[PDB]
Structures are given as C-alpha cells and as structure tokens.
A paper describes a structure:
To elucidate the complex structure with its substrates, an IVD construct with the E286A mutation was expressed and purified for cryo-EM preparation to minimize conformational instability caused by the process of enzymatic reaction. Thus, a mutant on the active site, E286A, was constructed and exhibited a stable combination with isovaleryl-CoA and butyryl-CoA, with apparent dissociation constant (KDapp) of 848 and 494 nM measured by surface plasmon resonance (SPR), which was utilized for cryo-EM sampling. Upon incubation with isovaleryl-CoA and butyryl-CoA, complexes of IVD with both substrates were resolved at resolutions of 3.35 and 2.91 Å, respectively. Following the addition of the 2 acyl-CoAs, the refinement process revealed additional tubular densities in the active site that ran partially parallel to the riboflavin portion of FAD, which were well-modeled as isovaleryl- and butyryl-CoA. The residues surrounding the active site create a relatively hydrophobic environment, facilitating the binding of both acyl-CoAs in a similar orientation. The residues involved in binding with 2 acyl-CoAs are predominantly identical. D284 and M280 form hydrogen bond interactions with adenosine at N6, while S222 and R223 contribute to interactions with the 3′-phosphate. In comparison, the activity of IVD for butyryl-CoA, which lacks a branched group, is no more than 30% of that for its optimal substrate. Comparison of the 2 acyl-CoAs in terms of binding revealed that butyryl-CoA exhibits a twist alternation in the fatty acyl portion, resulting in a longer distance and a less favorable angle between E286 and the Cα–Cβ bond of the substrate, which may contribute to its markedly lower catalytic efficiency compared to isovaleryl-CoA.
Author numbering:
A (entry chain B), B (entry chain C), C (entry chain A), D (entry chain D): 6 to 392
C-alpha cells in the first residue's frame, strides 16, 4: 500500500492505483518469464498499451497527444513500473525520458512533429547513445566521427550499452563532428539516427547479469548518410544538450530503485508473517523487526527525497547535484534493502523460484547503468567548488 | 544555504530567515560558552525574547498568545535553534512540545488558561517527567505512587532524566495511582505540578557528554499535596496521553539532528576551501568530495523525510510508526555525519576550539534520548504485526 | 598472489600452491561453463582426482587412506577451491567435512572401516541431511521420524537443502526415534543411509540464484529399512552429534567467503590497471584506491580471523560462538566486497562474460546457508547469557 | 577475560596477565580523574614503575635496558595499555615506539647511549615531532628551515600536535635543511632535541575533545642551537628515516583501539546482565544479543589481524600497507563498537559518571590522529598501482 505522506495531490494518487492494477493484471505475472528468457515477446503490444493509457510522453507538452504533466507523475510511473518488473523499468526510462525529453526540449518544430506522433503512441522505440566501448564514464571522449559533405553527415564508429538497441526505430546518437577543437566538449553533436538508413546495423543482444529482458547490443556505423535536417540542437553544441539532459535522466531513473525496494518489502512482509519458527511467526523476532524497520525507513526516506526533488524541478528549479544525489542514495539504499530482503527469506530466497533473486541483480544496474557512484559523487563535489 | 526544494511556503521561509537572523546575533556567538560552562545565565531573558517572537507557543492556539501554526513550523524552529546551539534546541523542544503542546491537546480550559499564557510569554518553563532511575525504556513499569486522600493526591517517589528540571515552573509528571491493577498500562495518571509545592525538591544538575547547558536533575516527591484540579487527561487512564505525547515528541525533536547536520555542513563546506594540502585545496580531492556528497545527500534525505511526515500530521495523517522511523533515521544519519565532519577538518576537529566536537556529542543524545533506538525499531516492527 | 602474513608452515604452504596450479587448469577454466549449465559433468572424475591428491580425507586419520592433518589445511583448501569455483567449493566442503569428520568423530570401528576408504578415495560422495522444508534454522523441530520394526529402523519423512543429493552414495540423516520425551532434542538420532536402499530416492535438482552447478535436491524416504548397525553415535543421542558437527561445519565453510573475496580482488586489481578514463588509468583515482584498500583490509582481516580461530580448534579448545562469528563476518564482508568489486568493472561487471556476478551470487549463500546470519548472533549472545 | 585464541605463547600470556594485574589498582582506578582534569598527577611515578617492568624497552635489547622481544609483544602490551585508561595509552606509544625504537633502529652508537638509557629506564620521556600547522597530511611539505653555520644547526619554524610536548625530555624533531631541492623528500633531515636547549620552548597545552591526559602542545623554535652530532640518520636523507617509524607506529598503535574495544566490552557485558527491563534482563533481548555479537566479532577480527601482522614483522617481512590497514580497520571498528556500547547503556551511557562517552571520544583519535584514513587509503592505492 501507500500513504499520503508523499504529498501526492489529486490526479496523481489515482494514477498510482491505475498503474498498479494495470501492471498487476498484465506485467506482474510475466516478470519471471522475462527474466528467465532474457526477452520480452510482448514488447510492442505493451508499448502500444502504454501509449494508449497516456503514460508515454508524460513530460511532453500537449501538442501531439502528450499528457503535459510534471516530472513527479513520470517519477511515480517509473517507480510503479520498476516495482512490477525491474527489467521493463530501464526500458521505459530509456524510452520516455532518454529520447522524448531531448526531442521536446532541444528539438525544433519540424523535428518533434515527425517522430513524437509515432513515438508517444508506442510505435517507435526511443534509444539513446552516449557511452562507448572505450568510454563508459568519460562520455565527452567519444570517437564517433561525423564528416560533413554538403547537406549530409557520414558517421563511422561504434557504440555500446545501448538500451533497446535492435528494437529502436529512432535513436539519438551523439557524434563528434570536429575532432580538432581545443575543448573536447565543443566537438560533439547530437543526431537523430533512424532505422533503415544504409550503413546502420546492430549486434546480438548482450547476456547481462540483471535486467534480463531489456535488449542491449552494439551499434555499428559504416558510411551512414545522416541528413542535415536530422540534427538535434545546434552544431558543435551537443554538450549543452547531453549534460543538461543527463541530470533529468538520473532524476527520473531514480524511481527505479524506489519501486524495486517497494516490491522487496511487499514480498518480504507477508512472508515474515506466514513463515513460522520456534513456535511463532518469524516476523515477531526482534532481529526481523529491526530489519523491517530499517528497510521501511530507508524506503520512505529515499521516496520522499526523490519526490521532493521532482517537485522542485516542476517549478523550474533544476540542479545537477541533487538529480545525481537522489539516484545515488536510492541505489545505495535499495542494494542493502534487497540484501536484507533476501536474508529475511532464508533458504527460500536463494532459489530462482522467488523474485527475491531478481531484485538484487536489478538493483545493481542503477549503480553502473546510469553513471557510476564515483561520477555522481564527483558531480556533487564539483557543485561546491564552484561557489 | 537552504534550498527551496524542501517545499515550504513563503511565510515559512520568512520565519526560517527571521529565526536564523535572531539566533545568529544572540545565540550563535555564546553557543560555545554555554557548552564550556554548562550554564545559561541568560536563559530566562532568552526565553522572554523567544516569547516575544511567539515561537514558544507556535503550536498553541492564538487565544493564549500563541502563533497557531502547524507542526512543520515547529520543526523549522527546532532545526534553526539546534543549528546554533544543540542544548538550547533540546531545551526548546522539551519546553514547547512536552509541556505546551501537551496541555493544548489533553488539558482542560482552566488548566490551559492558568499555565499556557506564562509558558508562551516565557514567564514559566515547562518540563516532562516520564523516565525513572529503574525504568528508562519501560515507562509502564514506573513505581511513582500517587495515592489520594479527599481532593488531594499524595505523590511519593523519585524520577530521573528530567529536562529543564531546576528551572521549570510548571511540570507535567506522570504517576502510577493503582499498582495492583491487572492492566499494567491502565494504572498511570498525569499530574501537573508546579514550583512552590511543599515536597517538590529538585536535585543538582547532571554533567553529561553533550547538550551542556540544559539543566537536567532528579525530581524528589515526598508527601506532596497536588490538588485534584491539576490532572492531565483522565484518572487511572494516563497511558493514552503518555503515548500521544510520545508519538508527537519524536517528530518535532527530529529537527535537532537536522539542525546539527546543517551546522556541521555550514562549518565544513567553507572550511574545505580555506585549507591547503599538496598545493591544492582539500575540497578538490575526490575522497573529500565523496564525503561532502554523502553528508549532503543524507541531510537532504532526512530533511525531506521529516518535512513530508510533519506536513502529513497537519491533515490528520498521524502515525507513531512514521514518527519513530523519522527520529531513528535522523539520529542515525546525524551521528555518522558528525563523525565524518570531524575527519574533514583533520586535527582541527578534535579540540574544543572548534564546534565540530560539540555537535558530535549532542547528536548522540538523539539515539538514546526520548526512547532508545532499539525501542524505536521494536515499535516500528510491532506496527506491521497488526495488518 | 597471497602473502606470508597467514603464518602457515612450509608444509601448509605446499598444499596452498599445489591446489593453485591444479585448480587453475582443471576447475578455473570451466567455472563459467559449470555456472551457466548448472551441471558438473566431470563431478566424479574431479572427485577421484582430488581423492588422489588426498584433500578429501585431509582431516581423516592415516589408517583409512586419509592425510592426518588439521582443520587449517582443510580451511585453506576450501578457500582455494572456492576461489577457483565457489559452487564446487560448497560441494567439496559439505562432502568432505560433513561426512568424514562426522564419521570419524562418532562412528564405531565397523562404520569407519566400511565407508571411509571409498569416501576418501573419491568413489563415494557424502552429504548431511539435517534441514527440512519447514525447519531451516530450527533443526530441533524436524518432522522425520523413525520406528523400530524389530532389529530395523523404518525412516519416514523428507529432507531438503541437501548438497550433493543425487550424487552422494553415503548420507548422514538425522531422524527422531522418540517423540514422547519432554525435551524435543532427546528424540533426534543420526543414521547412515546408503544410495540405492529400498525406499530412498531423490525428487529433482533445484535451481538457485548462485552456486550453480552444485547439485541440490529433496530427499524422500518411503518406508526405508535402514539396518540397526547403521546408527551413528548412540540411541537418542543425535543432537549431541549434530551440534558437534554444526559447530565444525561453520569453521570449515568459512573459506568459501574467503575464497570469493580473494577471487574478486584477483580479478578486479588487474582490471583497473588496464582500462583508462579521462586520460589515465582508473586505478589512479582516489575513489577506486579507497575501495581497493577497504576490500584488501577486509579480506586480510577475515582471513587472519579464520586462520587464527582454526588453529585454536586443533589445540583442543573449540567454542560454538567463535565458529558462528567467523562465518558470519566472512560472509558479510565477502558480500560487501563483491558489491564494490562488481561496481569497479563498470558496465563490464554487469554481464555474464565476467565472473563478478557469479562471485556476488555465490557470496549470498553463506549468509543463508550452513545456518542463518540471525541465528549466529543469537548463539553468540546466548554464550554471554550463560556466564 | 581474554582467551588463548589470540595465538599468544606461554610467555606472552604471562606478560598479558602481569599487565592486567599491574594496571589495576594503579592505573585504571584513576582514569576518571585523568579524564575529568586532563592531568596526570603521578605520570612520572607510573613511568618509573613501567620502566622497572621493562615494557618501555619491550622491543629494545637488554644491552641498553630493554627486554629484547619482538613487535608482537609490543602490540600486545599496548592493548593492555589504553584498556584500563585510554588517556595514558597514547603517551606510551609516543614514548616507546616513536622515540625509543626510532633511536634503536636508525641510530649510531654514540646517540644510542646518551638518551636511550634514560628513556628505557623511565627517567626521561620521549616524543616524536613531524607534524606542523601547514603540514598535517602532506608531511613532505614542511616549512621549518634548518641553516648550517658549522657544527651546529639552527632550527627556525613552528610545529603543532606534538604528543607528550610539555613533559618530554627527548624530542625527535624533523626539519628541512634544503628548502630549494626539487624532490621534497630529499630535503628532510631528522634531529634530536633535549629539554633545556636555548631557543626551544613549549606552548600552552591543548584541551582536546578526547584522550585528555596525554599532553599535547605547540613547539616554538626561535634561533635554536643543536650540535651536528645529534643528527638522526643522515643529512638530506631523512626520507627513509621518516617513513620507517611511521609504519611501525601504525603497526603498534593499532593495539590502542583494541584496548578500547576490550574495555567497552568488559563494561557492557556485565551491565547487560544486571540491568533489567520489561521483567527480563536487557542482555537476553535479541537486539542486545546482536549488538554484543557484532562487537565481539569486530574485536576478534581486528585483534587477530594486528597480531598476525606483528608476527610477520618479527621475522623480516614488513609492509607499510598492512600496518596502515590494520590500524585504520581497528579504528573504524572501534568507533562503531563504542557507539554500540553507549547505545547499550541508554541514559547512563551519556553522563560523565560512566566511561562510555570517554571511550567514544578516545576512539575518534585513531581515525584522524597518527595519520588519517584517507592518507592510509592513498598509500594502499599507490602500493597496489606500483605492481
Ligand atoms: C539510465 C539508462 C541510460 C544511461 O545509463 S546513460 C548515462 C550517460 N552515461 C554516463 O556515463 C554518465 C555521464 N557522466 C558525465 O558525463 C560526467 O559526470 C561529467 C562530470 C559531466 C564529465 O564531464 P567532463 O568531461 O568532466 O567536462 P565538463 O563537466 O566540464 O562538461 C563539459 C561541458 O558540459 C557542460 N555542462 C556540464 N554540466 C552541465 C549542465 N548541468 N548543463 C549544461 N551544461 C553543462 C560544461 O559547461 C561544459 O561546457 P564547456 O566545455 O566549458 O564549454
Ligand atoms: C526533551 C524531551 C525529549 C525527551 O527526552 S522524552 C523521553 C521519554 N521518551 C521515551 O521514549 C520513553 C520510553 N518509551 C517506551 O519505552 C515505549 O513507549 C514502549 C517501548 C512502547 C513502552 O513499552 P510497552 O510496555 O510495551 O507499552 P505498550 O506497547 O503496551 O503501550 C500500548 C498502549 O498505549 C496505548 N496507546 C494509546 N495511544 C497510543 C498511541 N498514540 N500510540 C501508541 N500507543 C498508544 C495502546 O492503546 C495501548 O493500550 P493498552 O495498555 O494495551 O490498553
Ligand atoms: C553446506 C551447509 C551445511 C549445513 O549443514 S547447514 C544447516 C545448519 N542448520 C542450523 O540450523 C544452524 C542454526 N541453528 C542452530 O544452531 C540451532 O538450531 C539452534 C537454534 C541455535 C539450537 O537452539 P535450540 O533448538 O533451542 O536447542 P538448544 O540450543 O537448546 O540445544 C539443544 C541441545 O544441543 C545441545 N548442544 C548445543 N551445542 C552443543 C555442543 N557443541 N555439543 C553438544 N551438545 C550441544 C544442548 O546442550 C542442548 O542439549 P539438551 O537439550 O540438554 O539435550
Ligand atoms: C616517524 C614518525 C611518523 C609520524 O609520526 S606521521 C603521521 C601523521 N603525520 C603526517 O605528517 C602525515 C603522514 N604521512 C603522509 O601523509 C604521507 O607521507 C604522504 C605525504 C601522504 C605521502 O605523500 P608524498 O608526499 O608523495 O611522499 P611519498 O610516499 O611519495 O614518499 C617520498 C619518498 O618516501 C619514500 N618512501 C615511501 N615509503 C617508504 C618506506 N615505507 N620506506 C622507505 N621509504 C619510503 C619514497 O621512495 C619516496 O622516495 P624517493 O624520492 O622516490 O626516492
Ligand atoms: C522529558 C524527559 C527528558 C529527558 N531528557 C534526557 C536527556 O536530556 N538526556 C538523557 O540522557 N536522557 C534523557 N531522558 C531519559 C531517556 O528518555 C531515557 O534514557 C531513555 O528512555 C532510555 O532509558 P534508560 O536507558 O534509562 O532505559 P534502559 O532500559 O536502561 O535502556 C538500556 C538498554 O536496554 C535496551 N532495551 C530495553 N528494552 C529493550 C527491548 N525490549 N529490546 C531490546 N533492547 C531493549 C535499550 O535499547 C537500551 O539499549 C529524558 C527523559 C524524559 C522523560
Ligand atoms: C608524532 C605525532 C603525534 C601526533 N599526535 C596526535 C595527537 O596527540 N592527537 C591528534 O589528534 N593527532 C595527532 N597526530 C596527527 C596529526 O597531528 C594530524 O595531522 C592531526 O589530526 C592534525 O591535523 P592537521 O589539520 O594539522 O592535518 P590533517 O589531519 O591532515 O588535516 C588536514 C586536512 O586536509 C585534508 N587532506 C590533506 N590531503 C588530502 C588528500 N590527499 N586527500 C583528501 N584530503 C586531504 C585531510 O584529510 C584533513 O582533512 C600526531 C602525529 C604525529 C606524527
Ligand atoms: C548440507 C546442507 C546444505 C545446505 N545447502 C544449502 C544451499 O546450498 N542453499 C541454501 O539456500 N540452503 C541450504 N541449506 C539450508 C539452510 O540450512 C537453511 O536455508 C538455513 O539454515 C535457514 O533457512 P530456512 O528458510 O530453511 O529457515 P528459516 O528459519 O525459514 O529462516 C527464515 C528467517 O527466519 C529467521 N529466524 C529464524 N529464527 C529466528 C530467531 N529466533 N530470531 C531471529 N530470526 C530468526 C532466520 O534468521 C531467517 O532469516 C543446506 C542445508 C544443509 C543441511
Ligand atoms: C542509453 C544508455 C544506456 C545504457 N544502458 C546500460 C545498461 O542497461 N547496462 C549497463 O551495464 N550499462 C549501460 N550503459 C553504459 C553505462 O552508462 C556506463 O557503463 C556507465 O556510465 C559507466 O561506464 P563504464 O563503467 O563503462 O566506465 P568505466 O570507466 O568502466 O567505469 C569503471 C570504474 O571507473 C571509475 N571511474 C571513472 N572515472 C572516474 C573518476 N574520475 N574518478 C573515480 N572513478 C572513476 C568508475 O567510477 C567505475 O567505478 C548505458 C549507456 C547509455 C548511454
């Protein structure tokens, strides 16, 4: 259940229960099979249903069918999706915020009018390309070259860790159009890559430890002709978009660990009351009660932090420090919460028949899949040295 | 510098700024001397000045001279007072909540009219008596007998850990009238004693690790004559006012750890830029940046948690489990933040010349004061065994 | 890559390097295959090769083909095998210790001569059957009962969480022979069960999150006619045999967490010296150096702890508190070190191509295997309450 | 009571028993006056008593007045020290390890007969001086210049945080003779200072937060006069001289927090078995049992590590990395163990009538003093990156 402590007003609490019911009747009985087979056969249908329900494009303005609400609604929807299935949560985050937000913020009129109608309804899949095989944290050191020949850009390089790679029809890929600039950041430029262009291909899916079901593969570029009209933002100014969007991406993806540990508690609490030992329920022992108290306090603290930070950005007060800090704290707490939940189940929590094993593997992604904790602490640290 | 992310009204921000301005001029410079001498000669004058500001009865009705504000503003004032001096913060918390807030919720009209105006204007100091030398956590096992004869109650016994003891003019003392009743909880009765009654003798102050300046002494009752009109709550059913006061005292007291963390951050963050090591400022090292990130994230998470829980209580969504959780989390995080703040200073954090040593000793009280930390875990755990 | 701080003798150092060169060509290159297939195809061949080396009966007397060494050599061999493959290490320990030690400490002159030769030689595999589906930590509440049908014992019930179930040829099973005794412990009795006896069978191998490749199943007893000569210990004396072996299995299995915490460091340190970020190797950053230092200090502390506690048990002074404390501390520290070790690889540590995920999944077992992290603290606390 | 599990021989156990029976009724019964007044009335008498037993020369041979034992006996006797009274615990380490052994290991025959026969016999007090206000972490960036005018060096500058300052008769002061050399390590040179030299003076003693009783003040050098024969080591080659005693310091001072943990355990275990709450002793609750288990496991883990490293050091194998790791882990564990011990006492652990707060304030020294944890982590990182 949930409490009104989060300060959720009208049209926000009803959406929570609606998403809960939808994911419990559709997504909840399928998370196990998704994690087992490492694939999601019902991906297109699920995306169509999400587009019809109006959760896709939640942050997009009301011009092409978006909802036009704040980030808090997106945060709670991401939290509920991660609570239902952690693997689908990363894909939803990459689709709704990693791609759509860059299109609605820096995309021009003709640009967003072409892709968003086919992206909000759930037809196209929105992927993002930043990291590279030789640049995980140092995103500004990318080697993807983009030479200019008239009104066409020829990209020749490779990407890695691309969420929803082979399924994405439109991909926001950052390319370094100028490798001779004095600042390394001034050379990168964002381009809208579309499926079906000559010279574009994708590799096989990666076999990850967790998040099994979210497709991820290597991107290959070989003489790919990118039109000049597909540029995002301005030329040689791609850093002012990537750096400004990565904060919102870390902010929205912070709801992931929230829903993960929420599901952890929702699975742990009834088990501690049903399972009995030493003549009584195991949930009455002081150690189990202390663990429950710690997990509940950590979950509530992280949820309130994320919600209060999301409410600030809805009013126009965005900071790079807080967006990284909230997701760092949420992931670092959700890891320990999942460990304690696996511990509370005992031997039964060690087999893959229970979803407790998936919660730990999924919680580890938010520490390395959305920037490492070291980079987050560095971003927070540099925020104080600038005063 | 506090951020607007906390989600406060403009009047609340103005009140916070006014408190910061008032305490910086009158309490912040002499904060170290109060800890060094364990005495506050200007206690009654500072209490009168606070009464002129209306912060003493900030949760009391306006008809008694109070401000009539909610618990959120009370937590704000607590955090602001604890930001300058932790001992004065604890004293204000024991005065405004344990005595003033208790009478407005369970006292009669005459009992309120007699005591509240002087308590709000700073004329009388309030105190609460729950702990005993033989019963610190198990308050139900108190042995203070309160046998009655006619229209007077004959109290006989001693109580320990009484905050603001020697300086309090009106005290709320919980006593046990019927010790032979089968229900151990249904035998307590709250009495409102005052200075001047024959038999009410206070002991000397107690020298403690922190919170120096708060007068704590042992109360001694030897055949005292308490009139039948100074009864708080109902006769032989004082357990309900005792737990109602206990559930709300942990919420307003959470500002103490918040204020201490704010103080240690406002002392550390500037200090890391006016200190040189290896030819550079110590604030530029990645380990110090990680320490700053951890401290800032913990402070922000605890503050948002406490604020969202306090705002929920203003609309009738009160819960003892949430209050115990927030106070436990705030104390546990403030202890670690105070431990880490000393390491940032290096050697300048292990001497009384810097306030970094005082904030650590004061933060330890919140883990053992107003209920033990393990008792909080037990209370939180027992809240799930009834669902 | 180890250091001489352990204080082991020259003979014990030879066994350390002997297994080092053997496991790195026989067990290490196939660890990923065993993990992904969850089936040790060369299980019996590897067991026979280990029996040729004498590491199976390393704690057995030299009369039955053993080695005659102490518990420290067994602990170091277990640590090395767990470093090579944590899944195979658990099976090796649960066979060697939990069979040979239980047989030599409580078996008569005939039972030792009958089973120990082929058990040490590797032809017979051993296992311990104490846990139940309804009793993991509360082993005294077992439901398996035995009834005397003349000079025979008809065992009825089921056993769960047995390592090497379908592979063990000789199994030690505890069965309650009396239920009318006032103490519940006075009814438990130990029996020797061979493979292929009428009424003995295995249901199916279960799948676990970690320790993949170690065969675990459910034991089913359907009117099993165990002879009276197969009783281990004495009549109605199984708990004294069980608790004696329970204290020794915790010390021997402590090398598992030690092995995993050594392997994560042996795989992490050479990785930070290769990958470069921001123009330099990631190993030169302070945030990585601090984590490496913490992991190394934790590993060394746990290793010295286990090695010093092991030496005390060979002299003739063993305690149940230390045996639980060492395994609890080792499991917790190994889990916390693997958590950082996966993060040190960045995105590469989240895929199955690297054994970091396997090391993490195998580390969680020792917190919920061979006892429970909660019950160990209870056993430790009950030691002080008895003094 | 300590057990033989630590790995001590018969002579070492007898030495531990002698220290336990000698420190009582002489030291410990007066650690509360030393803590309250920050003054040792019979410091010189206690030092003379220690000199009669030979603990001051535990590492020095019998030729000069010591006992001729190894560093294991030193780290053992420094655990009994600071156990009865943590205040005087730092003075013994600064006298024996920092001054006596520094002259024994890196001294000539002439200097090995003028000061050491006085220091080992307790007639003189020794101390080391390397830190300064501008260099507390960057020891190679000193500012104290040393100009040569023949056969006498004139020291000019200032130093801070010198242990045993106002009472040491022999002080080893490090000064830079060549402030123009490019390598900072090539300009440092060690010197021997004796009380009563012209230009040398001691400032006011510092009122530290904890460890009150171990004198510490500021050294002022104004046109000093030290003969050339008092140079320790070689001129312009004090790099290896400085960073050789700093390693044995970390190795030997690691027993400091071990004694603090032993003291808080010897004070916590009996108190939990005499204090009753809710009709039962507080030591029987599962939370207090878990706290005792964690404290005991941490103490046993930190104790075996330091002892094994000392055993390895007594044979030729020395490493600064392990010497820093053992003391940093010991301090980090002792802080939490003191926090838990104060938590187990509740209200009584806060007043100054109990040594709970004293042991907490004493434990914080080893984390910031004698080398911060960041310096040790950086040293371990540099040692790992060199290979
Ligand atoms: C959730 C699923 C999807 C994912 O997980 S993908 C996450 C992307 N992958 C990652 O690895 C995380 C990326 N991490 C980072 O980029 C780093 O944190 C970091 C510190 C920004 C690296 O930047 P640096 O190389 O050190 O250079 P820099 O900080 O000076 O930035 C270069 C230019 O960025 C600009 N910038 C930085 N923060 C900004 C902001 N909040 N808004 C707008 N612009 C911003 C900055 O002005 C600078 O401009 P210029 O170079 O001076 O002209
Ligand atoms: C400067 C000011 C700061 C300070 O220093 S204040 C220091 C005083 N703070 C303390 O925490 C004292 C210690 N507190 C405690 O020990 C806890 O209260 C503790 C552990 C729950 C008491 O233990 P128990 O004996 O088990 O009590 P219990 O569970 O049986 O009591 C339940 C009875 O209370 C009653 N109750 C009424 N309103 C309540 C309410 N709003 N919340 C909780 N309980 C409430 C509840 O109905 C129940 O009644 P009944 O006896 O079963 O009939
Ligand atoms: C690959 C993994 C390998 C594995 O085998 S894993 C399975 C390990 N299973 C576990 O359950 C471990 C955790 N549980 C335990 O340790 C015990 O079950 C537990 C809960 C502490 C025992 O508590 P209780 O059930 O209440 O029984 P209890 O403590 O009163 O003891 C009953 C009898 O045991 C006896 N006992 C205990 N330690 C002993 C020793 N070292 N030597 C001889 N006898 C010992 C004790 O004297 C008592 O005797 P009695 O009742 O007077 O007949
Ligand atoms: C003898 C008493 C010791 C004490 O009491 S001090 C504890 C707290 N007080 C302090 O002043 C700070 C403690 N020390 C430090 O923090 C470290 O020295 C510090 C400054 C972080 C290390 O950074 P750096 O300045 O770069 O110095 P460094 O490590 O590169 O060393 C410079 C030269 O020392 C040498 N060195 C280092 N460890 C050594 C060893 N175990 N044995 C012999 N020589 C050693 C190193 O070879 C180097 O010499 P070279 O110039 O390359 O020839
Ligand atoms: C108005 C007021 C003001 C106060 N001000 C102060 C102050 O400023 N400073 C101060 O120090 N104190 C103060 N106190 C006292 C403080 O409230 C008590 O110290 C606190 O409740 C704990 O009490 P105790 O340590 O005496 O209980 P104890 O029972 O002695 O607690 C000792 C230990 O027993 C443990 N314990 C008890 N029951 C259980 C259980 N069921 N399970 C597990 N563990 C258990 C506790 O966790 C604790 O660790 C004040 C009290 C009141 C009423
Ligand atoms: C013989 C001797 C006796 C001593 N006695 C005592 C004693 O009695 N009591 C005591 O408290 N201490 C003692 N010390 C420790 C020493 O005095 C410490 O330096 C003390 O804490 C004084 O600190 P400081 O502020 O001068 O230097 P520091 O402790 O180093 O403080 C400076 C700050 O700069 C930061 N900094 C510097 N470089 C880096 C970096 N690379 N990365 C991150 N941060 C960095 C620090 O970590 C630290 O926060 C003793 C040392 C010696 C050698
Ligand atoms: C040879 C052998 C091999 C095994 N191998 C494996 C293996 O590979 N993997 C595996 O998962 N299991 C294995 N087991 C089973 C393992 O022993 C149990 O999983 C474990 O002891 C407890 O788990 P449970 O869920 O069965 O017990 P439960 O008692 O159901 O544990 C549930 C939770 O209740 C808690 N609890 C119980 N009593 C108390 C109390 N008094 N106070 C506080 N908390 C309490 C426990 O701490 C635990 O957190 C093996 C057993 C044997 C005998
Ligand atoms: C849309 C998109 C989706 C992605 N999806 C996934 C996914 O689903 N799963 C996944 O695993 N990955 C994913 N990635 C990749 C992921 O974002 C990167 O792996 C992440 O930024 C960390 O990169 P790295 O580990 O490769 O960097 P690395 O350099 O490998 O990091 C290794 C270590 O180096 C440390 N380090 C680097 N710089 C510093 C510094 N200055 N100070 C201290 N330490 C440092 C890091 O902190 C880290 O601990 C995705 C990337 C994008 C762009």
């Amino acid at each position: 259940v949930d409490d009104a402590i989060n300060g959720l007003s009208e049209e926000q609490r009803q959406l929570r229960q609606t998403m809960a019911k939808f994911l419990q009747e559709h997504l909840a009985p399928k998370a196990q099979e998704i994690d087992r087979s490492n694939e999601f056969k019902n991906l297109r249908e699920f995306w169509k249903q999400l587009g019809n329900l109006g959760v896709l494009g939640i942050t997009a303005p009301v011009q092409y069918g978006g909802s036009g609400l704040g980030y808090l609604e997106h945060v709670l929807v991401m939290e509920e999706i991660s609570r239902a299935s952690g693997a689908v949560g990363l894909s939803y985050g990459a689709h709704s915020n990693l791609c759509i937000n860059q299109l609605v913020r820096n995309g021009n009129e003709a640009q967003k009018e072409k892709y968003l109608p086919k992206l909000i309804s759930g037809e196209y899949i929105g992927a993002l390309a930043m990291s590279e095989p030789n640049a995980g944290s140092d995103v500004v050191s990318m080697k993807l070259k983009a030479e200019k020949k008239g009104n066409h850009y020829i990209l020749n390089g490779n990407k890695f860790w691309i969420t929803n790679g082979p399924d994405a029809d439109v991909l926001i890929v950052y390319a370094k159009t100028d490798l001779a600039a004095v600042p390394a950041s001034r050379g990168i430029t964002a381009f809208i890559v579309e499926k079906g262009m000559p010279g574009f291909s994708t590799s096989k899916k990666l076999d990850k430890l967790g998040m099994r079901g979210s497709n991820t593969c290597e991107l290959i570029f070989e003489d790919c002709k990118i039109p000049a009209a597909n540029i995002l933002g301005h030329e040689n100014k791609g850093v002012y978009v990537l750096m400004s969007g990565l904060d919102l991406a870390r902010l929205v993806l912070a709801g992931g660990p929230l829903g993960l540990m929420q599901a952890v508690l929702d699975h742990t609490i009834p088990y501690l009351h049903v399972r009995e030992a030493f003549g009584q329920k195991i949930g009455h022992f002081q150690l189990m009660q202390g663990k429950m108290a710690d997990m509940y306090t950590r979950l509530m603290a992280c949820r309130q932090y994320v919600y209060n930070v999301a409410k600030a950005c809805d009013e126009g007060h965005c900071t790079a420090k807080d967006c990284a800090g909230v997701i760092l704290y949420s992931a670092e707490c959700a890891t320990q919460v999942a460990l304690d939940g696996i511990q509370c189940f005992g031997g039964n929590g060690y087999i893959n028949d229970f979803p407790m094993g998936r919660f730990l593997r999924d919680a580890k992604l938010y520490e390395i899949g959305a920037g490492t904790s070291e980079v987050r602490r560095l971003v927070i640290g540099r925020a104080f040295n600038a005063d």
